Amino acid sequence: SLSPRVQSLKPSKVMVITDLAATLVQSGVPVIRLAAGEPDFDTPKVVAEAGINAIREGFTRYTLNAGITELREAICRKLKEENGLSYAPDQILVSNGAVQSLLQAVLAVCSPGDEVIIPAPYWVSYTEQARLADATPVVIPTKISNNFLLDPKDLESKLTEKSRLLILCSPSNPTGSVYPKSLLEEIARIIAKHPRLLVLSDEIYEHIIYAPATHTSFASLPDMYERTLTVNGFSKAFAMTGWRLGYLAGPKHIVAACSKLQGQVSSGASSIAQKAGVAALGLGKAGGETVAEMVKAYRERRDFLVKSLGDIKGVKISEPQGAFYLFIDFSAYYGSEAEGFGLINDSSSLALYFLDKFQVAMVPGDAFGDDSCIRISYATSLDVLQAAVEKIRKALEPLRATV
Amino acid sequence: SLSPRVQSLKPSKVMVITDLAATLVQSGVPVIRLAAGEPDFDTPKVVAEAGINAIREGFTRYTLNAGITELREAICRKLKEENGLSYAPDQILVSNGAVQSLLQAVLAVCSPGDEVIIPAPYWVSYTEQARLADATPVVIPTKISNNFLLDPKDLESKLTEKSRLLILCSPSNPTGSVYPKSLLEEIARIIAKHPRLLVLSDEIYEHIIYAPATHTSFASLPDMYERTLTVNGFSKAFAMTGWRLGYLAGPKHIVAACSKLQGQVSSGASSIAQKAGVAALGLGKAGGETVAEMVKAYRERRDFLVKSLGDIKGVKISEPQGAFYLFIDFSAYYGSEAEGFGLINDSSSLALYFLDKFQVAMVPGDAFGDDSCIRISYATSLDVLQAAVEKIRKALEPLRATV
């Protein structure tokens, strides 16, 4: 009655839980919302004003399929100034959010049966998008003791003649890990020996990064420009969640194919959002002081959460180097019997315990391929995080941690 | 090097030609743009103001995946008041334009090898979206002498055990034809005898309709509610081209599957556009006097073009009953030798002659499955249409029409 690919598709637990918490709040049940990673900043003033001006001036008509020229040119300038990458404007495809940019890249390059190599913990949609292409996800687990970074030995062990695409998210959602240049250079030398292997570099969290970590675009590495699909966007750095503006930069032939696909599925961004994007890039390098305030706020929220929760017996934390998520290992608590709730034995039941009994919404690690952890978004206020920490502490107090 | 499905996908000639004409104008070459069907009205004042207010009030955060509640509820009210259809709010899925709504419906219901029945002339993307599902387009030509309406005898002759989805666009792009209720009732009786057969009713041009023609939603017909996927949207009726807001209404199980897919591909509409959509539906039944002005303008433009071009020797016109396209049969001119250009022998060469030699951009009928015609959009000013008619007349004057 439904197609196999849509029938077998897993729902996004980020969307399910975020929507559920929003619905609970509306019903009159307060919930601390730490699920979807949503900046609590407004869209910056000059960006919002560019969107308003676009409406006031009637910029509501047809726009070039791949994105307005002024936006693609500004994106090329950003990729050179910030990332050291040289793209022509027809190597940029602007879409309705970076998730659409990612999907079109996967659909364009993966043939049925190709393997898509996905390090876990992975962002929730990577495996499902591979399946939508009729491709095979090949998941490579990573370890909290190695800061959830891909071990190149494990990559070597999973390569086959069918390997087609490696997805690298850095800074990572959900772990907040940042790939150091030296490790990226080692991975690139592996990629270079396999002529069919492409890399999807998901860089949307680029500017949400905590020194001394630094961001290295994969396409800047030796021999990698011609095999890298660079995905970036506006939602996270510029608090543009609801505007929907992302982009792909890559080899001309692949971008041309993604653009042809976009023209037949009408996946473009709104004319209003595109004008707002031009203004966001006009804030200068890395978003200037506007984005710097955000990064400073996220860092102080990170520090508060890591200190507060790292003190709890049994908890294991990889201190994140970017993004605004903690991927916290509460697995020592699995097996606990919570009076009034029941057995807590996996990430789903632990997350449900926090939600149903303490009204704190988080996303279980199984959604990201690692049942040992729970993802907490900290793109919310310090007052809210303080309230959440008190509840998490009280929730774990009557339980027990294995040693 | 590219996936078979993306490699074999045809580019949209509407997008290619519209983008080309826009690029020519920018280079300093004036072009009369009659390709993509783009309202020349601004977005209505109260709709634009709702979008501005959404930005000013910070409505830029996460929104429910399937669309904000106030918009889905308003859509349900519209479907009852205007179309006689009863949907619950969780039977509505709001997306980034109606083209995305259509694609997700096709992907959700068509399994590999299923047949998608598509009357020609068809909108440019119907066959390609079927192919993206690994489904087989089954095209059924129609005839200008029957106002480009599906003959049910031809539908009967093309049904097989693999028939899964019939796509009905009414009012039609590209022909402007309107399916009368009696013909829809005959088609529905055919659908009812085949338990696997669903209908995608593309109703985006609903309000652009010229009395005495009237719009009948397919889901209102006997036995059809449970097999109809109703697609509608805001871009055409409300001059919201650049905003990107469409929706699907249908059986709960199918909408739930499309929503699950949307959550993993992030195909939702912007928060700003959704607030604008609420204001558009607040204009009252059929858009009230705001939309009535548009329909009156489009009708007078239709009448001017039909009268002006219908006078030309050899030209054949089906007077459209809705939408804002003329699908004009200039095929009597095929075989003509245009001095300075060459042989004109098909719709592509005729359209190229008009563009290169007279700077009038139109879309060849082959893009819509019927090489006998060329599509002209008349959602532009009367002064521009007068200029276009003079050029078309001069372009055909030295050529010859078979009899």
* DSSP secondary structure, B339-376, as one string: TTTEEE-SHHHHHHHHHHHH-EE-EEGGGGT-TTEEEE
Q: Quick check: A135 and A110 in contact, CB under 8 A?
A: yes
Q: How was this structure determined?
A: X-ray
Q: Any CB–CB contact under 8 A between B58 and chain A?
A: yes
* Cross-chain CB nearest to B61 (options A19, A125, A242): A242
B113 marked ligand binding residue? no
Structurally, at CATH architecture level, domain A1-60+284-395 sits in Alpha-Beta Complex (3.90)
Chain A segment 329-368 residues within 8 A of B by beta carbon are none
Q: Is B102 exposed, middle or buried (0-12, 13-18, 19+ CB in 10 A)?
A: buried
**Most distant CA pair in chain A, distance:** 64
The answer to whether the Cβ–Cβ distance between B242 and A267 falls below 8 Å is no
- H or E segment to which residue A290 belongs: helix A288-310
Using DSSP's 3-state secondary structure scheme, residue B159 falls into coil
Q: Would strands A373-377 and A325-329 be described as parallel, antiparallel, or unpaired?
A: antiparallel
CB burial readout B44-62, b (16+ within 10 A) else e: beebbebbbebbeeebbbb
Helices B288-310, B382-396: inter-axial angle, 10-degree rounding:
20
Q: Quick check: A96 and A268 in contact, CB under 8 A?
A: yes
Q: Nearest 5°: phi and psi at B246?
A: -140, 175
Q: How many A/B residue pairs have CB atoms within 8 Å?
A: 204
Chain B segment 151-210 residues within 8 A of A by beta carbon are none
* Cross-chain CB nearest to A55 (options B48, B62, B264): B48
Instruction: Report residue A48 as tokens.
Output: 């919002």
H-assigned helices in A67-168: 69-83, 98-109, 126-132, 152-158
Q: Any CB–CB contact under 8 A between A308 and chain B?
A: no
Q: For residue B69, count other CB atoms closer than 10 A to its CB.
A: 14
Chain A segment 228-287 residues within 8 A of B by beta carbon are 239-244, 253-254, 257-258, 260-261, 263-273
Annotated binding site of A for L-aspartate: 37, 123, 173, 375
Chain B partners within 8 Å of A15 (Cβ): 65, 263
Cβ partners under 8 Å of residue A173, min gap 6: A37, A123, A205, A323, A325
- H or E segment to which residue B201 belongs: strand B198-202
Chain A segment 83-122 residues within 8 A of B by beta carbon are 96-97, 99-100, 103, 107-112
Q: Any CB–CB contact under 8 A between B57 and chain A?
A: no
Instruction: Report residue B247 as tokens.
Output: 């929706």
Distance between start and end Cα atoms, chain B: 49
- Nearest chain B residue to A242, by CA: B60
CA atoms lying within 13 Å on the CB side of residue A181: 10
Q: CA-to-CA distance for B176 and B15, rounded, in angstroms?
A: 19
Distance from CA of B44 to the nearest CA of A (A): 10
Q: B116-119: long-range contacts (C-beta < 8 A, 24 or more apart)?
A: B116/B164, B116/B165, B116/B166, B116/B167, B117/B155, B117/B158, B117/B159, B117/B163, B117/B165, B117/B166, B117/B167, B118/B167, B118/B369, B119/B150, B119/B167, B119/B168
- H or E segment to which residue B382 belongs: helix B382-396
- Nearest chain A residue to B197, by CA: A1
Helices A271-281, A45-56: inter-axial angle, 10-degree rounding:
140
Residue count (chain A) = 403
Q: CA-to-CA distance for B280 and A198, rounded, in angstroms?
A: 45
Q: Quick check: A144 and A150 in contact, CB under 8 A?
A: no
H-assigned helices in A169-287: 181-192, 252-265, 271-281
Tell how far CA A154 is from the center of its chain. 23
Distances (CA, A) of A53 to A57, A212, B12, B15: 6, 39, 31, 26
Q: Nearest 5°: phi and psi at B117?
A: -90, 125
Q: Nearest 5°: phi and psi at B316?
A: -125, 130
- Nearest chain B residue to A35, by CA: B62
Q: Quick check: B167 and B126 in contact, CB under 8 A?
A: yes
The answer to whether the Cβ–Cβ distance between A254 and B109 falls below 8 Å is no
Instruction: Report residue B391 as tokens.
Output: 């050029």
- Amino acid symbol at A70: E
Chain A partners within 8 Å of B56 (Cβ): 48, 52
DSSP 8-state symbol, A21: H
Q: Quick check: B271 and A242 in contact, CB under 8 A?
A: yes
Q: CA-to-CA distance for B110 and A191, rounded, in angstroms?
A: 37
Q: CA-to-CA distance for A330 and A190, rounded, in angstroms?
A: 34
Nearest to A265 by CA among B84, B9, B278: B9
Q: Quick check: B390 and B382 in contact, CB under 8 A?
A: no
Q: Is B306 exposed, middle or buried (0-12, 13-18, 19+ CB in 10 A)?
A: middle
Cβ partners under 8 Å of residue B299, min gap 6: B210
Using DSSP's 3-state secondary structure scheme, residue B325 falls into strand
User: What is the torsional sign of CA B245, B131, B172, B186?
Assistant: negative
Instruction: Report residue A67 as tokens.
Output: 């994105």
- Nearest chain A residue to B379, by CA: A61
Q: CA-to-CA distance for B172 and B321, rounded, in angstroms?
A: 9
Q: Quick check: B70 and B59 in contact, CB under 8 A?
A: no
The answer to whether the Cβ–Cβ distance between A266 and B125 falls below 8 Å is yes
Q: Quick check: A252 and A45 in contact, CB under 8 A?
A: no
User: What is the torsional sign of CA B247, B253, B256, B261?
Assistant: negative
Distances (CA, A) of A97 to A254, A350, B258: 18, 31, 18
The answer to whether the Cβ–Cβ distance between B52 and A48 falls below 8 Å is no
Would you list the domain boundaries of chain A? 1-60+284-395, 61-283
Structurally, at CATH architecture level, domain B61-283 sits in 3-Layer(aba) Sandwich (3.40)
* Angle (CA) B125 B128 B132, round 5°: 130
* Angle (CA) A217 A221 A224, round 5°: 100
Instruction: Report residue B212 as tokens.
Output: 């005495």
